[PDB]
Write a protein that binds this DNA or RNA. Structure first.
Ligand SMILES: Nc1ccn([C@H]2C[C@H](O)[C@@H](COP(=O)(O)NP(=O)(O)OP(=O)(O)O)O2)c(=O)n1
Ligand SMILES: [Mg+2]
Ligand SMILES: [Mg+2]
Ligand SMILES: [Mg+2]
Length: 433
DNA sequence: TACATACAC
DNA sequence: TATGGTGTATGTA
């Protein structure tokens, strides 16, 4: 079963239009459309002489990148399929051959592929999703299970790269280069696994990943998809290609890299989001070769780091070694609620959040100098207000002391109107080096 | 240092 | 009735 690609957007708009949420989404779209219009004003003021001057600067840098292109590493991205929903499907048979999503009626974490055919997706509210699919089954989340399932897969992955990078519970990057070296001359004993009556996997990168996905399915009863490529950026993209329950390899030769990139929409790259797509689209840029073609223009319209990034993407480049993410930069907590307008209640809720945050800091023995409150009113508009201090702070009292005054300032500023808020949050940052 | 925006899960 | 939460990067002032 399923729905129509056009029936869907009609039901969403019909369900969402008029809400305070939609009002804020319009306010954001206008703010983006204006930011596009400003970029187009600059494109008109760009001279053919400037374009030539930049083109010569870009290609000089592009040659520096191209000559340092590293194809000697083998990078695997593993990504669980419909992760949360797959777990709930695994442990309740009644949800076999049925559309489901994990979450509440207010919000969904994810949805299984059956339900995806109706247009129900991650980050969608349940009440909207039920309009799209009345038979939809919303099952409450069990994060503790998901963490436990994750732990099972992370244990398998550690055989192939002990320094693998877990991006989240369902997701990881592996550098299997060093494993492939050792494995080249392994006996069938060291790469044989029994079915839950046994099987052997080859010496190749494709085979190594078939073993990983198999061992995962055997240990957890859940499928994963995987991507294989000479860098992280490519690997991530490939893992999505034959999803669910499939692989893809970009072989480690320059030509194959380029063939894959040629007509690849830039959205699919990790870091190109909804906005960057819409901005670049207005410059006629959709695919990665179009992104290469316009590289000069981009070096005049965007900041150094952004066009440097776009160039890496346009040449099929990316990170080839996994850096153990070291010290953290911020710790935070925030919560949504039904409207709170009484000041005394807002101080109480601030104090609560500061306590929870101090508790989380205690766990990692951390102290910081910057305390930042986050306030979101009933029309979904967001303010952050910060304050940095000489001496590091950490206790619930110390953090609350600072956040109290920031919140006071904001209540005082709108006076005599009360703050009609729907979410508050507190963040700490500026830990010592 | 302060604030907003964009992005990822 | 209803649109969640944590963390990093970065552009600007
Ligand atoms: N916005 C989001 C995105 C994901 N998640 C959770 C639910 C997902 O199952 C899990 C992993 O994210 P994900 O890999 O992007 N999606 P999911 O594994 O469900 O489907 P696939 O597209 O990978 O098959 O994080 C969330 O709670 N909020
Ligand atoms: Mg996934
Ligand atoms: Mg994921
Ligand atoms: Mg993207």
């Amino acid at each position: 079963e399923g729905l129509d690609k056009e029936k869907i957007n009609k039901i969403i708009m019909e369900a969402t239009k008029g809400s305070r949420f939609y009002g804020n989404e319009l306010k954001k779209e206008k703010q983006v459309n204006q930011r596009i219009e400003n970029m187009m004003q600059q494109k008109a003021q760009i001279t053919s002489q400037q374009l030539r001057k930049a083109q010569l600067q870009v290609d000089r840098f592009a040659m520096e990148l191209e000559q340092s292109r590293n194809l000697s590493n083998t990078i695997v991205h593993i990504d669980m399929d419909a992760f949360y929903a797959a777990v709930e499907m695994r442990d309740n048979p009644e949800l076999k051959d049925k559309p489901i999503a994990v979450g509440s009626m207010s919000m969904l974490s994810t949805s299984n592929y059956h339900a995806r055919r109706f247009g129900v997706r991650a980050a969608m509210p349940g009440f909207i999703a039920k309009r799209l699919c009345p038979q939809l089954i919303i099952v409450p989340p069990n994060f503790d299970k998901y963490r436990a399932v994750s732990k099972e897969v992370k244990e398998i992955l550690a055989d192939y790269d002990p320094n693998f990078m877990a991006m989240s519970l369902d997701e990881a990057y592996l550098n299997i280069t060093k494993h492939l070296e050792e494995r080249q001359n392994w006996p069938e004993d060291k790469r044989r696994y029994f079915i839950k009556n046994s099987v052997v996997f080859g010496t190749s990168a494709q085979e190594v990943v078939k073993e990983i996905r198999f061992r995962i399915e055997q240990k957890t009863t859940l499928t994963a998809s995987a991507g294989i490529a000479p860098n992280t950026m490519l690997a991530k993209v490939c893992s999505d290609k034959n999803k669910p329950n499939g692989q893809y390899q970009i072989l480690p030769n320059r030509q194959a890299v380029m063939d894959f990139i040629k007509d690849l929409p830039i959205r699919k790259v990790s870091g190109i989001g909804k906005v960057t797509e819409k901005m670049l689209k207005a410059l006629g840029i959709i695919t990665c070769t179009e992104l290469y073609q316009q590289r000069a223009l981009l070096s005049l319209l965007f900041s150094e780091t952004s066009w440097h990034y776009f160039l890496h993407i346009s040449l099929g480049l990316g990170s080839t070694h996994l850096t153990r993410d070291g010290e953290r930069k911020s710790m935070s907590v925030e919560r949504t609620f039904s409207e709170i307008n009484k000041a005394e209640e807002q101080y109480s809720l601030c104090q609560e959040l500061c306590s929870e945050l101090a508790q989380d800091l205690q766990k990692e023995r951390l102290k910081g100098r910057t305390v930042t409150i986050k306030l979101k009113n009933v029309n979904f508009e967001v303010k952050t207000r910060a304050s940095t201090v000489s001496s590091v702070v950490s206790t619930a009292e110390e953090i609350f002391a600072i956040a109290k005054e920031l919140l006071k300032t904001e209540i005082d500023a709108d006076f005599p109107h009360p703050l009609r808020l729907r979410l508050m949050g507190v963040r700490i940052s500026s830990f010592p080096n």
